[PDB]
């Protein structure tokens, strides 16, 4: 597995970006833009405490309250939630299980959060809120499979969750809800290829899933649904470069996908669709810096891409599609990824 993300990032309900990372104390810390604009100053680092052995995953409930999921020191799944939107936080609470990956989080069409994780059998497990943005939580259930990467989850344009994972053959496998909100899932299906990173999945402007991954010659590769919310999938295509991290993918305000990755010089590179969505790809460009994690991208309230990465000082650095100069948000972050 290629070097992974160190921070989770989300757009709050009031348009401020909020980053979550693991500290040197193995607590979860969070930083928040003071105002909803590109190159806004930040609140400074605030601790949620806890003791975590994975990447924390933040997700926004459908009522605007942030929720963070992480593997505890017992290797169970823990979580913690805002008690009101953008306000105070609950105590940490255990969802049990034993997980050997980073969680992957998405919300069902009925506002119920689903969490996915590799188990000790290397099978993919899930647990869900049994009501909209609310406990109590279901029991753990297995979707079987044998996965050698962290899972990645997105929703189909028809409301069916779809999970992607590397298998024991190192091809990309994937599995889908049979209906929206359903505990009934499809068989595992191979999309072939050779993947040397966690897959990252995004929905295109035209409702098609597109998956990106590092492949065998350290080039970036992608594969996409050829029609909305179904097969057949395209063949693998190459975007070249030589990368040394997982890719981070995001949509510009006009629908054009942009991909960010660490290069061989440990600088941040990017490549974007030109003209429009489902248009041709540019050549790679450098944004410089020196990074010790995969980048993480998100779109701010202004429609500008913002990218976050750990530096050599183990602080979090930001750059925005102004691109701007690199700036430090300070702090001291660790790579607690369950699968390295």
Using CB under 8 A as the criterion, which residues of the chain lie in contact with a second copy when the complex forms? 12-16, 36-37, 61-64, 84-86, 108-111, 131-133, 157-159, 180-181, 204-208, 228-229, 252-255, 276-277, 301-304
| One residue of 130, 226, 264, 328 binding ligand K3Q per CB under 6 A | 264
CB 30 within 8 A of CB 80: no
* Phi, psi torsion values for 116, nearest 5 degrees: -120, 150
Q: In whole angstroms, what is the distance from residue 64 CA to residue 133 CA? A: 9
Burial status of residue 115 (CB atoms within 10 A of its CB: 0-12, 13-18, 19 or more): buried
**And the tokens for 253?**
């305000």
The total of other beta-carbon atoms located within 10 Å of residue 99's CB is 26
Q: Which of residues 2-41 bind Na ion (CB under 5 A)?
A: 2, 4-7
- Judged by CB under 6 A, the stretch of 71-79, 96-104, 200-208, 326-334 that binds ligand K3Q is 71-79
Q: Residue 320, by phi and psi: left (phi above 0), alpha (psi -120 to 50) or beta? A: beta
Q: Is 215 in the site for ligand K3Q (CB under 6 A)?
A: yes
Q: Which of residues 221-250 bind ligand K3Q (CB under 6 A)?
A: 221, 236, 241-243
Q: Which does 198 bind (CB under 5 to 8 A by kind): Na ion, a second copy, ligand K3Q, none?
A: Na ion
CB 115 within 8 A of CB 126: yes
Q: In whole angstroms, what is the distance from residue 79 CA to residue 71 CA? A: 9
Q: Which does 73 bind (CB under 5 to 8 A by kind): ligand K3Q, Na ion, a second copy, none?
A: ligand K3Q
Q: Which does 293 bind (CB under 5 to 8 A by kind): a second copy, Na ion, ligand K3Q, none?
A: Na ion
| One residue of 51, 133, 229, 277 binding ligand K3Q per CB under 6 A | 51
228 vs 263, beta carbon nearer a second copy? 228
Q: How far is CA 202 from the centre of its chain?
A: 10
Q: Is 181 in the site for Na ion (CB under 5 A)?
A: yes
Q: Is 50 in the site for ligand K3Q (CB under 6 A)?
A: yes
Q: Is 58 in the site for Na ion (CB under 5 A)?
A: no
Query: Beta strands 113-118 and 124-131: pairing type?
Result: antiparallel
Closest separation between CB of residue 325 and a second copy, Å? 19
């Amino acid at each position: 597995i290629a070097l992974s993300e160190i921070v989770s990032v989300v757009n709050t309900s009031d348009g401020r970006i909020e980053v979550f990372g693991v500290g040197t104390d193995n607590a979860v810390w969070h930083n928040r833009q003071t105002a909803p604009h590109s190159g806004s100053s930040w609140t400074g680092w605030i601790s949620l405490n806890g003791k975590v052995t994975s990447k924390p995953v933040v997700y926004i409930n459908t009522d605007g309250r942030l929720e963070v999921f992480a593997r505890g020191t017992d290797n169970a799944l823990w979580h913690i939630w805002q008690t009101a939107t953008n306000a105070g936080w609950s105590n940490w609470q255990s969802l049990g299980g034993t997980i050997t990956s980073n969680p992957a989080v998405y919300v069902n069409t009925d506002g119920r959060i689903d969490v996915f994780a590799r188990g000790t059998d290397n099978a993919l497990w899930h647990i869900s809120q049994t009501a909209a943005h609310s406990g109590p939580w279901s029991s753990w259930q297995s979707l079987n499979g044998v996965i050698t990467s962290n899972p990645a989850v997105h929703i189909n344009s028809d409301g069916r969750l779809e999970v992607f994972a590397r298998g024991t053959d190192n091809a990309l496998w994937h599995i889908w809800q049979t209906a929206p909100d359903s505990n009934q899932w499809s068989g595992w299906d191979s999309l072939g290829g050779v993947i040397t990173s966690d897959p990252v999945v995004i929905g295109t402007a035209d409702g098609r899933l597109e998956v990106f991954a590092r492949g065998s010659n350290n080039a970036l590769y992608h594969i996409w649904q050829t029609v909305p919310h179904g097969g057949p999938w395209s063949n693998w295509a190459s975007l070249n470069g030589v990368i040394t991290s997982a890719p981070a993918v995001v949509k510009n305000s006009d629908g054009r996908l942009e991909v960010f990755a660490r290069g061989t010089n440990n600088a941040l590179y990017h490549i974007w669709q030109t003209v429009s969505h489902s248009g041709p790809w540019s050549n790679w460009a450098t944004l410089n810096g020196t990074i010790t994690s995969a980048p993480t991208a998100v779109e701010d309230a202004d429609g500008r891409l913002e990218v976050f990465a750990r530096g050599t000082d183990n602080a979090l650095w930001n750059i925005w599609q102004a691109w701007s100069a690199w700036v430090s948000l300070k702090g001291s972050l660790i790579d607690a990824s369950a699968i390295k």
